[PDB]
Amino acid sequence: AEAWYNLGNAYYKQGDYDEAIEYYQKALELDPRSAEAWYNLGNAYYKQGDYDEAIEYYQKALELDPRSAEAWYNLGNAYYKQGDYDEAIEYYQKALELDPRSAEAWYNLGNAYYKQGDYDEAIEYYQKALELDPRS
Ligand SMILES: [Cl-]
Ligand SMILES: [Cl-]
Ligand SMILES: [Cl-]
Numbered sequence: 001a002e003a004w005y006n007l008g009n010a011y012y013k014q015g016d017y018d019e020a021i022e023y024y025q026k027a028l029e030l031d032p033r034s035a036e037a038w039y040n041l042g043n044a045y046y047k048q049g050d051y052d053e054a055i056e057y058y059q060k061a062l063e064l065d066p067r068s069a070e071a072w073y074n075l076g077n078a079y080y081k082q083g084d085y086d087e088a089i090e091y092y093q094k095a096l097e098l099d100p101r102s103a104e105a106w107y108n109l110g111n112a113y114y115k116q117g118d119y120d121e122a123i124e125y126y127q128k129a130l131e132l133d134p135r136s
């Protein structure tokens with residue numbers, strides 16, 4: 001499983017996402033408990049703009065490792081890309097539970113409320129993002 005997974009990563013690093021997907025799937029066929037293989041398979045589909053597959057595979061990663069702030073944040077991003085702003089808020093909130101000092105998560109939480117027309121909530125979360133990164 002380790003050699004298929006790292007072959008997938010060597011493709012992913014070059015932006016060869018079709019091949020990354022092929023080889024991550026071979027890794028998972030052999031070891032389906034690898035949170036990291038599911039998460040990176042999700043990432044390869046995300047990079048291709050296939051958000052339905054990204055969401056499916058991030059959800060599997062997070063079943064195996066619910067302490068992955070990165071998987072929560074990227075699941076929020078995949079739902080944001082689909083215009084599902086309440087699910088973006090749901091998963092950004094989980095990422096911030098695990099890393100309250102993530103300027104990126106505060107900012108994207110702000111952008112989900114902005115897309116809903118809740119501009120005062122957006123202001124609140126952009127203010128938190130700027131408390132952490134005043135040069136953004
Ligand atoms: Cl992970
Ligand atoms: Cl889940
Ligand atoms: Cl929604």
Ligand SMILES: [Cl-]
Nearest residue numbers: 093094096097
């Ligand atoms: Cl919160």
